[PDB]
Amino acid sequence: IRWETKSCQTASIATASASAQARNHVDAQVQTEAPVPVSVQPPSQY
Amino acid sequence: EVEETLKRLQSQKGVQGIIVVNTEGIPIKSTMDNPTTTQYASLMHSFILKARSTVRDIDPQNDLTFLRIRSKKNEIMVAPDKDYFLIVIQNPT
């Protein structure tokens, strides 16, 4: 005959943002040098 | 001795210059102007390497014996050797 009223509640949760990324690239530039440290005719005496 | 023989060759009516290429395309003696001295020495060094390889490729038991190049302007002859070759240029006219 005794009806008791009760109130229930569950705990809340917490989320968080995040990200993923594959490997990254970057540019590059090269110029080949053309040095010619060469004389005309060295008179050798080997 | 050899200096006189080179002059002797130079005196020949055909010969227009002599270059003694020693250090892998860098000459040590020349009877020509500086631009030509280096021009011929360098170019012919590259070529003779090709010519000697060509002989080894066409037959694996032979080396170069001689090469001749002819052109409208002039003609160039080279012979191979153990250490280094020699360039002679003539006027075919």
SS3 B4: helix
How many Cα atoms are found within 13 Å in the side-chain-facing hemisphere of B43?
A: 11
Among B16, B10, B23, B33, smallest CA distance to B84 is for B23
The enclosing H or E element of B28 equals strand B26-30
Place of tokens 């001795």: B1
Q: How was this structure determined?
A: cryo-EM
Q: Which chain A residue has the Cα nearest residue B24?
A: A38
A8 close contact with B: CB closer than 8 A: no
CA dihedral for B72, B44, B41, A34, sign (positive or negative): positive
CA distance B51 to B69: 11
**∠ CA(B57), CA(B58), CA(B60), 5° rounding?**
60
CA distance A7 to A1: 20
Q: CB pairs under 8 A, 24+ apart, for A6-13?
A: none
Residue range of the domain that includes B14: 1-93
Contacts of A9 (CB under 8 A, 6+ apart): none
CATH number reported for the structural domain that contains residue B13 in this entry: 3.30.450.30
B33 close contact with A: CB closer than 8 A: no
Residue A30 token pair: 């090269």
CA distance B5 to B12: 11
SS3 A24: coil
B22 close contact with A: CB closer than 8 A: yes
Resolution value (Å, 1 decimal): 4.5
**What domain count does chain B have?**
1
Among B17, B43, B21, B42, smallest CA distance to B31 is for B17
Residues of B with CB below 8 A from A41's CB? 26-30, 34, 37-38
